[PDB]
């Protein structure tokens, strides 16, 4: 499974997406039910977001706000009321650090 982004919004638009897979436990990149998330706010809860950036679409967020989101992209935590599917969790990924 490969991935690629091109643009802040894109990065985020994907972030919340990729993250989703985790919220559910999936391993592959799943899509977020924006519609349902729009029509029904009681779908997926988003927390950990940065200060000044509420749990909403990145479309309403500017490059600035985004730059932040992607920053706390780790903080951002999605909640899926629905039950699990079946797949061991993967807390943190780790890797090289810039500093």
From Swiss-Prot:
There is a cross-link at residues 27, 35, 75, 77, 90 (Glycyl lysine isopeptide (Lys-Gly) (interchain with G-Cter in SUMO2)). The N-terminal half may have an activating activity. May be a transcription regulator involved in cell-cycle progression and skeletal muscle differentiation. May repress GTF2I transcriptional functions, by preventing its nuclear residency, or by inhibiting its transcriptional activation. May contribute to slow-twitch fiber type specificity during myogenesis and in regenerating muscles. Binds troponin I slow-muscle fiber enhancer (USE B1). Binds specifically and with high affinity to the EFG sequences derived from the early enhancer of HOXC8. This is General transcription factor II-I repeat domain-containing protein 1. It is found in: Nucleus. Interacts with the retinoblastoma protein (RB1) via its C-terminus. Belongs to the TFII-I family. It is linked to GTF2IRD1 is located in the Williams-Beuren syndrome (WBS) critical region. WBS results from a hemizygous deletion of several genes on chromosome 7q11.23, thought to arise as a consequence of unequal crossing over between highly homologous low-copy repeat sequences flanking the deleted region. Haploinsufficiency of GTF2IRD1 may be the cause of certain cardiovascular and musculo-skeletal abnormalities observed in the disease. It comes from Homo sapiens. GTF2I-like repeats lie at residues 8-93. Highly expressed in adult skeletal muscle, heart, fibroblast, bone and fetal tissues. Expressed at lower levels in all other tissues tested.
